């Protein structure tokens, strides 16, 4: 570890790796710090789902997710256990136990919100859905020129899509995918468009998908190295970043204070530029720990000196969920083009079809897979091949259906996985609603209570705003119930429900972007630069100030590409 | 990858790595293949619990375990779901579905048995308890001379313990550990002795333990390298070993058939010595796929050509579990030496002790920690410090209580982790019974059903033997009830129970060791060589032919060490 | 004492549960945070569904209950009638 | 008076219940009192408890009793999963 770098990035998720990729490639001496460790295989910060074992045992991956999602704010527990032995030590009060937060009102929380501390961040476990936001969900980069605004966003998105390797044909020859996609397309013909979820992923084989991650964006190997001899990069895992030091004039950051978790020692790191990409919650924590905003329960009677909007206007999406069991009619349609020569198991059994026949309801790639399945496996009563990938269908947010949708199978299952019903029959439904930014909705940090890293404990003051947010959320639920029924009935144990506020992990607006600090109620400008400070930048979903339904990561990445263009224009790399 | 090695080892668990450590050390050219991949970070095959984050959020680690335990044999599911929508597709039978094994009798299973496919094997997640077996539990390595047998075991264990870095001092200054240990010592005074569970681990810091693993035994780095420029070792991950090829006379192995899972390519690898350390289930799977023992449902009318005892006499331990909530008396005794005045939270409150007083119940370090906790956290009603490590207590197996005991906190929790009761109060109790080896208890492999790697599907025919094993399992239950009540009453949700057969993962005797193939009904000799074959060696818990209650891994290692002594005596390494 | 209850012994528990009314039920503080945003939800754990705001949940006899029928609890009891020995007896 | 769902996979002929009842020391501090403001379903003052099992002999005996039940019951059989040894609600 050196003492001085051109650039220092806090956090090694995909947004920090965006800044790494742009600035390391542009010749800056870059240091990156993460509080978590390299745990993930030889490809540093790669997707954990990319092993042969998780791709043969994809029901198990939920365990990896759960194992690295740690709850942000757990209210004091009031459950009554009144069947302890009389000899056992027993509480007189509901006192603060097990890491809980006494500042947290249980009824105004985002109880599902969680954070991940591993190199690569949450991109080590994510679903990889990278849709663009349309105008209605997206903040303005240009004022007073819609066409120019769209042009700027299209340029940033096309880059971001390239970094992530976003694509929309990786599931094109999945039977289950097309079964679902075709039925919904038909059902909403002239009303709604359905397509594959855009995915940051590259298919390698018919049974393997290489899912994208922070590693894809930047490979996180220290530099110079053989393949990049003139670049300069160091990653320092197990380093808790604690405070950015402000000059007295509140115009420049002078250092970053770090705590090495292995040695236990503390250090002051100097940079020309400081970039915080520690996620929506922890970027906010790090700033409040540094004198930005207001530490403690909000007190309107005392304006903070800096960033009064910090941690207000936070948004989290409502999420509805269910699973369906494929209708008999749809399953029968899978085998419609087949010729079935008699009784299964017995000599009188050929399964054939006519390639290219114009009476055929399905393509030839579909019939050949069904044929070979029905012939290699004549005990099995379903026409869906055993290896066939899950659907990945969406109809994107529009004004007449203002929610995002993901239809298929997500690795994050929410209950014990059922085993009685054949898995090929099961389709998940997740609808995601947008939340109006409101000043009263707040993430703040205690001035007494601390977390397991000794930083001020985060505390939420959150309710879904009345009015449109709440109206839409319920309309969204009914839409899921109506649409899902076209495919099949609900699976008992996965009936239509709202998920725990915040489980969806799409928290935005904790350090929101705008043109003007005061009139837009924001903390950073459209360069992601913190108002008043020359050399401090913030990256991630915390930047997004709008009400959005779709998954925010590609959009945060686009914003980070723009911020890097500013940094490149205003700071010069040190000589090599 | 070469065609030709001195030694090939199949499996990179800690037994594999014992063979590599000995043979790579002695100058042999070694290759190891593992079906799974590297994913413990830059330390290949290291313990996944060695992150600062896991050791701060101890509850979370069970997810990692559950993530990489895949059930060996799941019977066909016959759960009735009769609340499907009438439009959903439903079969009219309980057909073979979702990977289940139609060979498996649900009533004669080890349903909790499971395997792990990752470089470092189960040592990447284990508990690291490494006790010796006493004579009663241990196979003979020398007959008719008890002193020479004790001497050989002592030598081999001692060597095993240096490999794993086993110790009994890492929890010595935990208040909770000492509280439980002292009370148990006092209560059974001169009927039973208690001590710390011997653990393969080194404490780094008051709040961090470096848990040992395969990596501790052998770092798994390709050699030659700057640290070992004369050594020759290559690891090949993502390689499924499928068959060993026998010569016509069944006196030697001629090659190893493998399948590179990333590329799809198949190869036959040549070696002088072939070592199988694929685990108790998979070593057997591979032998049977190579024409040892018998494929398919056991048929005593058709004797096997080779190794007639392969897969019979299997043992797996009974396990009984509860948790307790610490007694008021025990908790009050934590502060026995303190003078407490005034009222918590007021400026008049104080807590003090008399250092060195010979009438103090506890040592100065105890009293200092309690004092600082009670003075700094006057809102907390417990005298135990917040990061006190957990208890790690055992009373080892003896003839008058012939079960192993582990008292404390295990990372493998079995239910939802409860939050109402302060974790500082909770003590886990696991007692492990020994199971008599019986011929009728079998692991066999289907001749038609294959597993997710297209190998013969494992199937169990198992029941705890009547007579001694059963009598002891139920006496062991009563023993856990009786001892645990000395410390406190049962935690609701964790009441005294037998765990699922095989959940404990101490399967033994699948390829058991003995002096004589016929008279001892076994598969390998005391050099772990397969009878008949000059150059084929098996390693692991599969070898242990006795009824044991203690954790087997250290014992299997000690056998691997002896095996390597035989290899050094009978094969010469190739010149560098 | 019906032929049906002594043929279906498992079912009589329902009769017992049906006439045991809880004596003191503390205010409920279970958190249900998966309601639709359009549903009415109050801001506190207010006194709801017949609960008793005087009751400390941690110093209760939560299982205690009463029966208001002619014959009282002798309409459902187990009928066990031991004598007390001296130690137990006033 | 069964306490949970009735299990149907184990033949009811095998199943034996165990209930052990401890004695509780009478203590002035254990009280049943009635609210001067809250009323029950029949317009009468709401009953409220302030109870804990007394430390000392009551509590020691109760734990000794739970242990005795684990010891005695094992002479007849192992525990039925779902009805493991437990204290019931006060
Ligand atoms: C967990 C989850 C998340 C997402 C999906 C599903 C699952 C189950 N699916 C997904 C999501 N995003 C979408 O756009 N599409 C989808 O299909 N998920 C969210 C996505 O995963 C995040 O939006 C994205 O990674 C966030 O990127 P980031 O801003 O770079 O933040 P990360 O949380 O990934 O990484 C931050 C990082 O910094 C570290 N850290 C935290 N505090 C410190 C301090 N104080 N010092 C140093 N380092 C710090 C963390 O350790 C972490 O790596
Ligand atoms: C999972 C677990 C295990 C243990 C404890 C707790 C938990 C939850 N605690 C524990 C253990 N044992 C102890 O003595 N002490 C305790 O405190 N656990 C058991 C222990 O972990 C095992 O006994 C030990 O690893 C076995 O060592 P091994 O014989 O080297 O076998 P592994 O299963 O670790 O590794 C074998 C290995 O080979 C691979 N494989 C499997 N099949 C193939 C084929 N066909 N080709 C190539 N490679 C193969 C695996 O992927 C694996 O790595
Ligand atoms: C419910 C139950 C009870 C017993 C056991 C099993 C179960 C599930 N088994 C048991 C019993 N006791 C035995 O010694 N051995 C066993 O094997 N149980 C308890 C027993 O049932 C009670 O001890 C007994 O009936 C008490 O008799 P009681 O003192 O006569 O009181 P009851 O509660 O039976 O009847 C009182 C009664 O008067 C009424 N009432 C209440 N308030 C008013 C007012 N304000 N005005 C007029 N009447 C009032 C009730 O309606 C009731 O009928
Ligand atoms: O809860 C899982 C969901 O998590 C969200 O964070 C993702 O963006 C979705 F893709 C995913 O379906
Ligand atoms: O199931 C957990 C148990 O697993 C067994 O494999 C271990 O040996 C114990 F150490 C551990 O407590």
Numbering used by the authors:
A (entry chain A), B (entry chain B): 43 to 618
C (entry chain D): 92 to 181
D (entry chain D): 454 to 543
The authors write:
In this context, Trametes multicolor pyranose 2-oxidase (TmP2O; EC 1.1.3.10; for a review, see) is of interest since it can oxidize both β-D-Glc and β-D-Gal to the corresponding 2-keto sugars, which are intermediates for production of D-fructose and D-tagatose. TmP2O is a homotetrameric enzyme produced by lignocellulolytic fungi and has been assigned a role in lignin degradation. The reaction catalyzed by TmP2O is of the ping-pong type involving a reductive and an oxidative half-reaction. Therefore, to evaluate and compare the productive and competing sugar-binding modes for oxidation of Glc and Gal, we used crystal-structure analysis of 2- and 3-fluorinated Glc and Gal derivatives bound to the TmP2O variants H167A, V546C, H450G and H450G/V546C.
With the aim to identify TmP2O variants with improved turnover of Gal and a more equal conversion of Glc and Gal, results from saturation mutagenesis returned the TmP2O variant H450G as having increased Gal conversion rates with O2 as electron acceptor compared with the wild type, while retaining acceptable Glc conversion, giving a lower Glc-to-Gal selectivity. His450 is located immediately before the start of the highly dynamic substrate-recognition loop in TmP2O (residues 451–461), but is itself not part of the conformationally more dynamic region of the active site. In the H450G–3FGlc complex (mimic of the productive binding mode for Glc), the mutation is accompanied by only minor structural changes in the overall active site, including mainly relaxation of the backbone at position 450. Compared with H167A and V546C, which retain His450, the backbone at position 450 in H450G is relaxed by the His450→Gly replacement, beyond which only minor structural changes in the overall active site accompany the mutation. His450 is close to both Asp452 and Arg472 (important determinants of regioselective 2-oxidation of Glc) when the active-site loop is in the productive semi-open conformation. The corresponding selectivity ratio for H450G is 9 in favor of Glc, meaning that if to achieve a more equal conversion efficiency of the two substrates, the relative preference for Glc over Gal is more favorable for H450G. Thus, all else being equal, the H450G mutant is the preferred variant for achieving a more balanced yield of products from Glc and Gal oxidation.
